[PDB]
Structure formats: C-alpha cells, structure tokens
C-alpha cells in the first residue's frame, strides 16, 4: 500500500540495555564533565548531573532494601520541581514501574489514577501531600508517603533524603550500584495518564522498549537535538505527562541543562531565556500569545535562542509564523504524539519546515490516514483519521482490555482519534480531535480552525470553541473568549470579525461568551464539555 508513510532509519540505532542502563551511561558521562542537569528558573537552584545520578542510584538501592521487587510500583504526585525525575530514574534503574501524577489533579482524578496504578510508595510534593493523604484513605494499599521537595522531614513524613538514609547502609557507595536488566519489550517502565480525557484517567503502560526508542529520536540529528556540552533548554511543560516526561528524559540523554520554568509572566519568561542563555524552548500553544504580543523582546538578550518548539495541542499556523518571524527563525519546530505512543511520532525534521505542518513520521514508525467510514487508507491531501504503528506503541491500558482493543486494531494500528492529512511530500498536518468536530448540518467544523482565527485578533488573549445543541442544525459553533486587558469586544464584534474570515458553515451561530479563563487541560487541549456548559448559561 503506497498510502502508508514509512519513517527513515534512525541515525543512531537503538542501544542495547534497558532505559535505566542508557540513562546511567549518559548521565555518568555528563557527571564527569561537571555539567548541570536541572535548574529551577525562578530560584536559580541547580542539580549537577553528578548529584542527580548519585541520588537516583541511592534511591534505587533504598527501594530494593525497602523490599520492592521487579515489576513493583511507585508513584509521584507533584507539580513540576527539580527533584521530579529522581524517583523516575531510580525506578527505571531497578525495574520498578513509576506512575507520575500532578498535584493539580482533582481528588476524583487522583483517587481513580492511583487506584489503577496501585503504588506502594508515593513521592509527594509538600503541596500535593494533603491530596495524597486523602487518596490513601481509599487506596489503602499505599504504604508510605515520602516528601519529594523538602530537605527535612515534613509534617511527620520522611523527606527523600531521609528515606534514602533510613534504607541504605552507612557509607553505601552509589558508584557500586548496578542497573537491573529487564525484558525490554514487556517490562513496564511507566504508567502514564493522558490529559484532557472526557472520562476518568486510564493507566497507559509504557515499556523500556518504548523509552529506548524515544532515546534514539531525542539524539537524532534530524528528528531530535544533537549532543552539545551544557547547552540550556527552557521547558514549561508538565513533567508528569508524556510531553514533559519524554522531552525531559531525552534532554538528559543529550546532556542538556534543563531549565524548568513554572511561572509564565512575560518578564520572568524572557529574563529566564536571557539569564540561562537558552538555545531551545519547548512550549504549549498558549504561551505563543505572550511572545507574539510582547513589547519587551527588545529589552532582553535573546540571541542564544535558535529553536522554538510546540506540542500538545493545535498551534495556529499564523501565530506560530509570527513568533518565528519575531525571533528570525525559519519556523516553529513541532511534535505530535499521544500518551499511548510514548512521545511524538510526527516531528518537524531539521531543515525540512513546511508552513503549517506538524512534521514527518519519525524513524521506525509508519503512519496512514483512513477514511472515517470505510477505514481504508487515503492518498495525500485527503482528510481522515491518523493511524500509527511502531515500537513506541504502549503495551496497553492497565486492567482495561476493552479500551486497548478499541484503540489498537486487529492489524496492530493505533487509531489516534485525530483528523489530519499528509501532503505530496509526506508532511503531516494535524487538524483537531475527531470527537471535537462540530456537526453543523452536514459539515464537520474543527474548533481549532475557529480558535486560530480568534487568536489572531489583537484584542483577544485566548479562546476556545465548541458546539451548542440546535434542533435544526444539530450543533452550532460557539466560542468562549478571554479579552486582552483594557480591550473590549461585544459578542456581535467577535461574530462579525469571524464571519469576515471564514466560510458560512464556520460562523459562530452558537454565540460568544466572555470569561477570565478558557477551560483547557494540562497540555493545552480545549475542554469542550466545559465550554458547552458556559455557552448554555443565560448571560
Ligand atoms: N502537535 C499537536 N498538534 C495538534 N494536536 C496535538 C499535538 N500534539 C498532541 N496533540 C493532541 O493531544 C492528544 C494526545 O493527548 P494526551 O492523551 O494527553 O497524550 C492527541 O491525540 C492530539 O489530539
Ligand atoms: O499529547 C502528547 C503526548 S507526548 C506529546 C508530545 N511529545 C513531544 C515531543 C517533542 C515535541 O516537539 C512535541 C511533543 S508533543 N504530546
């Protein structure tokens, strides 16, 4: 089938050994250089590769002495912090699966998520502690809670350093620790949760094989970033999620200084880019607005920044192009993937930007676009459902064989639930989620297309689009808008603006509501259910 698109051979073949073995190999190399692994942008605290490796090795030994066996389970519940990856790396080192969650989960989400992954130990931030304690009342198999981001015991709980001390012999030599080899294709490494799900979280089982494939991509000269000493990357993406998880672990393989930024006011963002001499930034679409509108770019030395990348949700072509222009870059680097595919499976190749494209199929992967009804493959410039196949496909959902079967078909293809197409040169374009399409008469209107028009208006800060039920037409496109501070538009002004830029079918017949915040998930995907509720309210 000439409709199947096949990625090229990786520059660097997948290395032998587990994901833990590969992380140890590379982290050790950078430790001996005296390189910095993590930096908290706002406090300036650094962890060297040496320190980070040592603590991860020591925690690995501590977890074994505690009694965890291969295929045991631990979790994190934490907002981004520079310590986040210590339990991740320790777990990869010893073959104990790690279930990352964020302090920002609701209690309903967290009780469900940890109820699935069943961690013996939870590494909680101080901020997340109350939620973890509450969850433990239901998930009573959680034996131990350790405080991730404290140097001292906190509210009666052992901090990370105390847990290590209490579970390793005095004088223990970290240098003596050995990574545990595992059955690479079968051994669960991580249990992840998607963001912006319409249901409760499912546990996505990712293996060592999945991760070591990502490591080949991350170092790839075309599909990743080249190793270069102590180079700094600014990251704003949630670590507990696949997007932050696998960009960050890839950066550690590459020896980068990971500059973690948790505050998004414009001055902090730009001061961080400048002060840490960041060469790359990895963003969610919302933050492009800041850069496009900023009047302060000129006040900072931003000359080190040579790559701006996006992922997680649709990025307006025109907003991306404007920001790339401001920074005198060819284009925005993009990646598209799902939690269930580990990381990005379509990535902008270096030297192969195409306006609007999400990129090309990554090495070792294949992709196709299928007809929404027949499920047969399509040629170029034909919209349908994107499907992918390759060694980053998850092992399956935890204890949910029905959901696994719905996602990955009898021929091994993962159905992404996303509409897109590829062009004659095989660049893929991702339009929106199938479940998000607005069924106006016989049309299927993608909210992202309307959101892009709205985000181009200089008086609009943010917007989200969803369908309002209608007896005659089925659904009407409607919008929630956050106005820029000091600017005003009426509902009619917004509607008329949109009507001037779009086809008849795409008009905002469902109306416009003004709000302080557009409901979005943790990686920027629009919360349609929440938008529909706002639109329904008499205002
Ligand atoms: N570059 C991208 N452009 C458009 N949508 C994206 C992109 N990357 C991720 N997504 C969306 O995010 C979904 C995966 O979200 P998650 O389940 O949280 O991993 C995909 O199915 C897409 O709908
Ligand atoms: O929804 C998801 C799950 S993993 C992922 C991404 N991973 C990435 C890696 C690099 C990149 O540039 C862009 C992306 S998006 N997006």
XYZ file of C-alpha atoms and ligand atoms in Angstrom:
578
model
C 0.000 0.000 0.000
C 1.618 3.186 -1.278
C -0.672 5.159 1.099
C 1.383 4.034 4.120
C 4.086 6.550 5.075
C 7.275 4.963 6.473
C 9.824 6.867 8.578
C 13.547 6.695 7.742
C 16.291 4.727 9.506
C 17.469 6.406 12.725
C 20.971 7.952 12.611
C 21.723 6.215 15.915
C 20.376 2.638 16.211
C 18.550 1.765 19.401
C 21.208 0.978 22.010
C 21.462 -2.296 23.906
C 20.273 -2.343 27.508
C 17.301 -1.040 29.472
C 16.169 2.568 29.607
C 17.807 2.677 33.057
C 21.098 1.357 31.662
C 21.082 4.001 28.911
C 20.264 6.845 31.278
C 23.067 5.709 33.621
C 25.586 5.530 30.753
C 24.846 9.060 29.556
C 24.289 10.684 32.947
C 27.646 9.299 34.107
C 29.401 10.847 31.111
C 27.928 14.270 31.782
C 28.524 13.961 35.552
C 32.247 13.570 34.930
C 32.170 16.833 32.908
C 30.684 18.761 35.808
C 27.580 19.581 33.768
C 24.301 20.868 35.256
C 21.247 18.629 34.709
C 18.385 20.671 36.213
C 17.883 24.313 37.061
C 14.874 25.897 38.748
C 14.420 29.050 36.651
C 12.787 31.061 39.414
C 15.046 30.209 42.378
C 18.222 29.504 40.431
C 18.826 26.220 42.282
C 20.954 23.752 40.263
C 21.378 19.992 40.381
C 24.507 18.744 38.663
C 24.403 15.540 36.629
C 26.682 14.070 39.300
C 24.267 14.906 42.121
C 21.210 13.784 40.191
C 22.784 10.473 39.198
C 24.040 9.817 42.739
C 20.623 10.443 44.305
C 18.885 8.288 41.692
C 21.330 5.388 42.287
C 20.945 5.763 46.080
C 17.136 5.833 45.827
C 17.304 2.723 43.592
C 19.212 0.848 46.311
C 16.877 2.238 49.000
C 13.801 0.949 47.161
C 15.332 -2.531 46.866
C 16.319 -2.583 50.576
C 12.740 -1.465 51.407
C 11.599 -4.663 49.675
C 10.275 -3.585 46.281
C 10.725 -6.242 43.635
C 10.919 -6.091 39.843
C 7.507 -5.027 38.485
C 6.587 -3.352 41.774
C 5.032 0.136 41.662
C 5.771 3.622 42.971
C 4.157 6.953 42.115
C 4.835 10.693 42.166
C 2.257 13.308 42.959
C 3.925 16.635 42.296
C 3.811 19.835 40.336
C 6.986 20.402 38.356
C 10.022 20.617 40.649
C 13.685 19.950 40.021
C 13.535 16.697 42.091
C 10.737 15.207 39.974
C 12.886 12.844 37.957
C 14.794 11.273 40.859
C 12.088 8.625 41.569
C 11.537 8.216 37.804
C 15.165 7.420 37.139
C 15.507 5.252 40.284
C 12.507 3.203 39.129
C 13.965 2.763 35.640
C 17.249 1.673 37.219
C 15.649 -1.160 39.264
C 12.715 -2.290 37.137
C 10.006 -0.844 39.384
C 7.207 0.812 37.440
C 6.629 4.539 38.083
C 3.221 6.233 37.951
C 3.558 10.031 37.620
C 0.682 12.324 38.619
C 0.403 16.070 39.228
C -0.648 17.882 42.421
C -3.165 19.724 40.228
C -5.291 16.589 39.676
C -8.676 16.818 41.361
C -9.179 14.335 44.169
C -11.609 12.370 41.957
C -8.906 12.122 39.282
C -6.142 11.243 41.731
C -8.123 8.627 43.635
C -9.001 6.987 40.313
C -5.488 7.199 38.883
C -3.633 5.854 41.900
C -6.370 3.270 42.359
C -5.361 1.872 38.971
C -1.567 2.059 39.309
C -1.515 0.854 42.940
C 1.796 2.386 44.104
C 3.393 1.016 47.287
C 5.152 4.361 47.881
C 4.039 7.837 46.750
C 6.653 10.585 46.374
C 4.574 13.679 47.085
C 5.442 17.355 46.916
C 4.627 19.393 50.035
C 1.790 20.959 48.020
C 0.388 17.592 46.986
C 0.605 15.998 50.429
C -2.971 16.627 51.620
C -4.371 15.113 48.447
C -2.109 12.077 48.766
C -3.149 11.569 52.412
C -6.801 11.780 51.340
C -6.287 9.355 48.452
C -4.581 6.887 50.843
C -7.871 6.697 52.800
C -9.423 4.986 49.733
C -6.345 3.393 48.139
C -5.344 1.822 51.443
C -2.544 -0.218 49.839
C -0.365 2.950 49.700
C 2.081 2.055 52.459
C 4.438 5.031 52.529
C 4.450 8.700 51.569
C 7.809 10.406 51.035
C 8.187 14.208 50.636
C 9.909 14.893 47.343
C 10.758 18.605 47.646
C 11.934 19.059 51.217
C 15.419 18.675 52.695
C 13.934 17.852 56.097
C 11.097 15.662 57.336
C 7.800 17.417 56.810
C 4.504 17.128 58.700
C 5.602 13.788 60.152
C 6.644 12.306 56.791
C 10.157 11.316 55.735
C 11.692 13.541 53.068
C 13.526 11.970 50.111
C 16.959 12.234 51.754
C 15.656 10.667 54.985
C 14.032 7.798 53.124
C 17.339 7.135 51.387
C 19.332 7.371 54.633
C 16.943 5.033 56.506
C 17.041 2.447 53.712
C 20.777 2.272 52.838
C 23.764 1.120 54.936
C 26.038 3.871 56.289
C 28.893 4.559 53.882
C 26.975 2.987 50.976
C 28.808 3.671 47.738
C 26.479 4.884 44.970
C 29.238 4.040 42.450
C 28.721 0.358 43.330
C 25.049 0.255 42.301
C 24.126 -1.832 39.237
C 21.163 -1.155 36.942
C 18.789 -4.078 36.630
C 18.318 -5.538 33.165
C 14.765 -6.383 32.224
C 12.759 -7.976 29.444
C 12.754 -4.813 27.356
C 9.620 -5.320 25.244
C 7.457 -6.482 28.155
C 8.710 -4.738 31.298
C 6.538 -1.812 32.303
C 8.626 1.281 32.942
C 5.970 3.939 33.420
C 2.239 4.157 33.962
C 1.070 7.403 32.430
C -2.175 9.357 32.284
C -3.413 11.404 29.339
C -4.637 14.963 29.876
C -7.996 16.353 28.787
C -9.749 12.984 28.785
C -13.571 13.145 28.766
C -13.602 10.205 31.184
C -11.553 9.263 34.259
C -7.808 8.634 33.747
C -6.685 5.305 32.274
C -3.259 3.927 33.094
C -1.083 3.777 29.988
C 1.643 1.131 30.304
C 4.896 2.131 28.619
C 7.861 -0.262 28.403
C 11.623 0.017 28.340
C 11.490 -0.677 24.607
C 9.191 2.292 24.152
C 11.598 4.530 26.035
C 14.853 3.449 24.383
C 13.160 4.145 21.017
C 12.439 7.680 22.233
C 16.120 7.950 23.197
C 17.157 7.291 19.586
C 14.775 10.054 18.387
C 15.952 12.501 21.026
C 19.604 12.391 19.898
C 18.717 12.193 16.206
C 20.321 14.947 14.109
C 17.159 15.278 12.001
C 14.382 14.248 14.404
C 15.822 15.436 17.731
C 18.644 17.596 19.061
C 22.393 16.982 18.828
C 24.535 16.445 21.907
C 26.340 19.723 22.769
C 28.012 20.435 26.161
C 25.969 22.131 28.913
C 23.607 23.742 26.340
C 20.435 25.088 28.063
C 16.784 24.288 27.174
C 13.813 26.119 28.694
C 10.884 23.855 29.480
C 7.351 24.837 30.626
C 5.517 21.529 30.073
C 4.133 19.316 32.902
C 6.641 16.578 33.833
C 4.043 14.006 34.904
C 2.618 13.950 31.354
C 4.226 12.226 28.333
C 5.018 15.549 26.680
C 7.177 16.736 29.627
C 8.322 13.237 30.577
C 9.893 12.294 27.267
C 11.246 15.634 26.205
C 12.953 15.933 29.601
C 14.402 12.400 29.650
C 15.625 12.940 26.069
C 17.332 16.179 27.176
C 19.185 14.265 29.891
C 20.359 11.713 27.274
C 21.590 14.737 25.246
C 23.439 16.281 28.235
C 21.418 19.487 28.252
C 20.810 21.812 31.178
C 17.070 21.512 31.729
C 15.860 24.985 32.798
C 12.474 24.330 34.380
C 10.115 27.308 34.406
C 6.855 27.206 36.352
C 5.931 30.940 36.197
C 4.658 32.348 32.907
C 4.507 36.113 33.412
C 6.247 37.719 30.454
C 9.124 39.291 32.392
C 10.116 36.014 34.118
C 9.845 34.107 30.857
C 12.125 36.496 28.970
C 14.536 37.002 31.884
C 14.885 33.208 32.035
C 15.612 32.913 28.312
C 18.306 35.568 28.704
C 19.911 34.683 32.046
C 20.364 30.969 31.328
C 21.308 31.560 27.679
C 18.613 29.138 26.500
C 19.098 27.725 22.963
C 15.723 25.986 22.726
C 12.344 26.411 24.302
C 9.616 23.865 24.470
C 6.115 25.354 24.793
C 2.388 24.627 24.806
C 0.377 26.756 22.279
C -0.958 29.203 24.944
C 2.452 30.822 25.548
C 2.925 31.777 21.908
C 0.444 34.601 22.586
C 2.826 36.125 25.107
C 5.714 36.132 22.632
C 3.616 37.398 19.729
C 2.251 40.342 21.721
C 5.269 41.204 23.907
C 6.620 44.730 23.644
C 9.639 43.788 25.734
C 11.569 41.385 23.475
C 13.941 44.203 22.682
C 14.896 44.671 26.365
C 16.489 41.206 26.589
C 19.413 39.443 25.006
C 17.536 36.620 23.297
C 20.338 35.930 20.809
C 21.034 32.427 22.174
C 17.537 31.187 21.233
C 17.708 29.274 17.950
C 14.775 26.847 18.259
C 11.181 27.338 19.333
C 9.163 24.134 19.598
C 5.486 23.400 20.250
C 3.416 20.365 21.051
C 0.443 19.011 22.954
C -2.375 20.794 21.120
C -3.110 22.556 17.804
C -0.947 25.643 17.200
C -2.375 28.407 14.979
C -0.255 28.400 11.792
C -0.299 32.180 11.647
C 0.557 32.725 15.312
C 3.473 30.299 15.023
C 4.695 32.052 11.857
C 4.523 35.475 13.505
C 6.525 34.267 16.524
C 9.128 32.532 14.319
C 9.467 35.832 12.407
C 9.970 37.905 15.569
C 12.872 35.623 16.503
C 14.232 35.487 12.953
C 13.835 31.683 12.852
C 12.723 29.677 9.775
C 9.748 28.165 11.645
C 8.371 26.627 14.848
C 9.544 23.043 15.454
C 6.556 20.833 16.163
C 5.894 17.374 17.556
C 2.672 15.372 17.576
C 2.030 12.268 19.616
C -0.224 10.686 22.217
C 0.407 9.314 25.708
C -0.288 5.891 24.140
C 2.554 6.383 21.590
C 5.063 7.357 24.356
C 6.193 10.547 22.693
C 5.971 12.417 19.382
C 5.603 10.146 16.346
C 5.447 13.030 13.838
C 8.198 15.658 14.246
C 9.422 18.583 12.123
C 12.722 17.353 10.611
C 15.709 19.737 10.867
C 15.972 21.569 7.511
C 12.504 20.440 6.401
C 9.987 23.015 7.673
C 6.748 23.254 5.674
C 4.225 26.004 6.512
C 1.521 24.633 8.853
C 2.912 21.092 9.071
C 3.243 19.052 12.269
C 6.217 17.297 10.635
C 7.198 13.891 9.253
C 6.871 10.300 10.510
C 9.662 9.521 12.979
C 12.276 6.788 12.427
C 10.975 3.210 12.915
C 7.348 4.379 12.648
C 4.667 4.117 9.964
C 1.557 6.259 9.603
C -1.578 6.313 7.476
C -4.759 8.377 7.192
C -8.010 6.417 6.996
C -11.486 7.167 5.691
C -13.768 7.941 8.644
C -16.406 5.446 7.481
C -14.671 2.694 5.468
C -11.403 2.696 7.495
C -9.463 2.301 4.240
C -6.206 4.192 3.679
C -6.172 7.501 1.828
C -3.800 9.287 -0.520
C -2.319 12.752 0.061
C -4.429 15.844 0.679
C -7.348 13.788 1.945
C -8.613 14.314 5.486
C -9.279 11.316 7.688
C -8.169 9.633 10.887
C -4.433 9.407 11.548
C -3.224 5.879 12.483
C 0.296 4.883 13.531
C 2.358 1.766 14.125
C 5.813 1.316 15.648
C 7.851 0.425 18.732
C 6.622 3.288 20.896
C 3.071 1.908 20.977
C 2.064 1.275 24.582
C 1.779 -2.240 25.983
C -1.905 -1.483 26.759
C -4.084 0.151 29.405
C -3.845 -1.204 32.949
C -6.694 -3.635 33.576
C -8.758 -2.340 30.655
C -8.588 -4.796 27.748
C -11.739 -3.313 26.126
C -10.217 0.168 25.893
C -6.975 -1.304 24.498
C -8.902 -3.180 21.804
C -10.830 -0.045 20.819
C -7.586 1.929 20.360
C -5.290 -0.579 18.677
C -6.853 -2.646 15.898
C -6.553 -6.275 14.829
C -3.754 -5.310 12.430
C -1.732 -3.554 15.122
C -2.547 0.045 14.037
C -3.211 2.625 16.744
C -6.215 4.811 15.847
C -5.321 8.245 17.234
C -8.771 9.819 17.226
C -7.264 12.794 15.351
C -8.189 14.203 11.998
C -5.391 15.105 9.652
C -3.839 14.595 6.238
C -0.412 14.365 4.600
C 0.755 16.311 1.554
C 2.614 15.147 -1.567
C 5.988 15.470 0.170
C 4.664 13.417 3.146
C 4.411 16.303 5.620
C 1.585 15.596 8.057
C -0.945 18.170 9.200
C -2.991 17.566 12.387
C -6.297 19.431 12.352
C -8.149 18.550 15.588
C -9.708 15.707 17.539
C -12.482 13.756 15.766
C -14.636 13.947 18.925
C -14.307 17.739 18.865
C -15.693 18.291 15.363
C -18.833 20.421 15.376
C -21.698 18.837 13.449
C -23.340 21.866 11.852
C -25.827 20.445 9.307
C -23.720 18.090 7.148
C -20.447 19.919 7.956
C -17.768 18.789 10.406
C -16.258 22.036 11.676
C -12.915 21.767 13.530
C -12.844 24.063 16.591
C -9.088 24.593 16.126
C -9.714 26.335 12.805
C -12.029 28.844 14.500
C -9.791 29.164 17.564
C -6.937 30.125 15.222
C -8.991 32.935 13.682
C -9.931 34.196 17.153
C -6.323 34.070 18.452
C -5.207 36.235 15.540
C -7.338 39.135 16.758
C -5.219 41.693 18.671
C -7.970 42.229 21.348
C -8.341 38.502 22.101
C -5.994 36.831 24.575
C -7.412 33.289 24.500
C -10.367 31.415 23.028
C -11.988 28.013 22.898
C -14.688 26.743 20.561
C -17.370 24.074 20.973
C -20.787 23.114 19.618
C -24.124 24.337 21.047
C -27.054 21.898 20.532
C -29.585 23.108 17.973
C -32.847 21.402 16.912
C -32.490 22.343 13.192
C -28.756 22.255 12.530
C -27.615 19.700 15.142
C -24.786 21.802 16.578
C -23.810 25.479 16.256
C -20.201 26.662 16.674
C -19.868 28.878 19.757
C -16.874 30.458 21.461
C -15.586 31.459 24.866
C -13.199 34.409 24.679
C -10.769 35.963 27.161
C -10.249 39.601 26.131
C -6.838 41.270 26.355
C -6.592 43.548 29.418
C -8.000 47.003 28.631
C -9.564 45.892 25.332
C -13.267 45.180 24.700
C -15.319 43.435 22.027
C -19.067 42.797 22.054
C -20.411 39.379 21.057
C -21.500 40.936 17.753
C -17.980 42.347 17.174
C -16.434 38.888 17.639
C -19.070 37.178 15.477
C -18.696 39.733 12.664
C -14.898 39.518 12.803
C -15.053 35.711 12.477
C -17.700 35.845 9.734
C -15.314 38.091 7.734
C -12.552 35.453 7.877
C -14.425 32.131 7.474
C -16.917 30.168 5.362
C -20.640 30.357 6.123
C -20.616 26.941 7.848
C -17.987 28.131 10.301
C -19.864 31.188 11.647
C -20.219 31.413 15.446
C -24.010 30.906 15.337
C -23.788 29.459 18.873
C -22.725 32.848 20.222
C -19.804 34.227 22.194
C -19.290 34.284 25.964
C -16.621 36.297 27.702
C -14.646 34.714 30.556
C -11.450 35.116 32.612
C -10.079 31.684 31.646
C -10.673 29.257 28.769
C -11.145 25.739 30.208
C -8.185 23.674 28.947
C -6.403 20.537 30.106
C -2.865 20.257 31.423
C -1.215 20.364 27.960
C -3.483 22.936 26.336
C -6.291 20.867 24.831
C -9.666 22.620 24.901
C -12.220 21.257 27.407
C -15.251 21.040 25.130
C -17.636 19.808 27.837
C -16.782 22.805 29.998
C -17.115 25.242 27.091
C -20.551 23.835 26.188
C -21.650 24.415 29.799
C -20.543 28.062 29.720
C -22.284 28.573 26.362
C -25.541 27.075 27.723
C -25.760 29.563 30.616
C -28.121 32.544 30.232
C -25.805 35.587 30.182
N 1.270 18.880 17.731
C -0.010 18.636 18.005
N -0.972 19.270 17.235
C -2.321 19.050 17.440
N -2.723 18.222 18.443
C -1.791 17.597 19.206
C -0.419 17.787 19.018
N 0.228 17.014 19.930
C -0.703 16.377 20.675
N -1.958 16.726 20.229
C -3.269 16.273 20.751
O -3.083 15.664 22.015
C -3.586 14.342 22.002
C -2.809 13.446 22.950
O -3.072 13.951 24.242
P -2.673 13.073 25.523
O -3.751 11.970 25.587
O -2.804 13.942 26.796
O -1.378 12.416 25.334
C -3.506 13.918 20.544
O -4.397 12.845 20.281
C -3.882 15.212 19.849
O -5.282 15.413 19.850
O -0.047 14.519 23.920
C 1.153 14.284 23.835
C 1.760 13.076 24.490
S 3.529 13.142 24.120
C 3.297 14.524 23.277
C 4.470 15.202 22.650
N 5.762 14.858 22.750
C 6.600 15.689 22.124
C 7.981 15.702 21.974
C 8.591 16.724 21.251
C 7.831 17.736 20.663
O 8.484 18.712 19.960
C 6.429 17.753 20.792
C 5.773 16.744 21.501
S 4.144 16.610 21.743
N 2.055 15.021 23.199
